[PDB]
Amino acid sequence: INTITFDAGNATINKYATFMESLRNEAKDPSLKCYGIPMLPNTNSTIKYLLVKLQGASLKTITLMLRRNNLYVMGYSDPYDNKCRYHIFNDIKGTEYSDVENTLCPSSNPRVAKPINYNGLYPTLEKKAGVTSRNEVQLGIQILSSDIGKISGQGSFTEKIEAKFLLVAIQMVSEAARFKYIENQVKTNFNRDFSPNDKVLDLEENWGKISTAIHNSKNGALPKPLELKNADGTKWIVLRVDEIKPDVGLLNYVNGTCQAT
Ligand SMILES: *[C@@H]1O[C@H](CO)[C@@H](O)[C@H](O)[C@H]1NC(C)=O
Ligand SMILES: Nc1ncnc2[nH]cnc12
Predict the structure, then answer these.
(1) What is the largest CA-CA distance in the chain?
(2) For residue 66, which of 24, 50, 117, 258 is within the disulfide window of CB 3.0 to 4.6 Å?
């Protein structure tokens, strides 16, 4: 399928909202769904990967590659020195590595590797970015755009601006597609840089747990209380699907049948 493109350089709320629904519809399994929330396919889908190309105000682009099963960013490419430069995490190896390498930069055209010499987990990217927690890294449409410019087409760049770019892009593409609440935090703060609040980090952290709970609900009631966090960090106890459903855009794959609507 189509590369999903988003222009951060000339963005509006409505263009970002279109981007998110295009991403959720290409990513979802067409028939899996629980309580009306679409689910991701499992690892034997016909299409296993999705490509997302981001463009900044400088008009330079970066293309992210995502595993469709769980929306994980595996690596990215940029136009560099008349070549396709592919950047892959140090733990993507074998079959995956070269479906990534060869889908980001076709073997029939000039290309070059520039490894990401660390993995894609949040503790690793926070360490590389120089912060204690990723709430110290600001998100926003201008920051994503300036960050594309600092990497795309550049010979040299630091591991600190690369890992800040990836914390920003993972949350504004993958976490925003998974959670309607994070998509709504970006649209609210559309014209300013903002820091992710406590409910944003708590949802990011409990995606798998939320999906399993919704899938296992009987007549709209969660198997057991789900303890999450409000925007100010206070405890939030969730007992029913309709309480949490406003914040969720996609379920992580969970095997078996569930109430579809
Ligand atoms: C997945 O669910 C199906 C349908 O209930 C079941 O037959 C199968 O054993 C499950 N697979 C695993 C690994 O649990
Ligand atoms: N590489 C990544 N892609 C998507 N979501 C993530 N959350 C943690 N790391 C991530």
Answers:
(1) 58
(2) 50
CA distance 179 to 247: 6
User: What's the number of domains the chain is made of?
Assistant: 2
Distance of CA 65 to the CA centre of its chain: 10
9, burial (CB in 10 Å: exposed 0-12, middle 13-18, buried 19+): buried
In the chain, helix, strand, coil percent, each to 5?
40, 25, 40
- Enter the tokens of residue 173: 């593409």
Q: Are residues 147 and 81 in the same domain?
A: yes
Ligand 1 pocket, 44 CB below 6 A? no
Asked if residue 174 has its Cβ within 6 Å of ligand 2, the reply is yes
Helix residue spans in 130-194 (DSSP H): 141-151, 159-169, 176-178, 180-188
The reply to whether 144 and 196 lie within a common domain is no
Residues 167 and 138 sit within 8 Å (Cβ to Cβ): no
End-to-end CA distance of the chain: 28
Minimum-distance ligand to the CA of 116? Answer: 2
The resolution, in angstroms to one decimal, equals 1.9
- For residues 168 and 190, membership in a common domain is answered with no
The ligand 1 atom nearest the CA atom of 256: 2
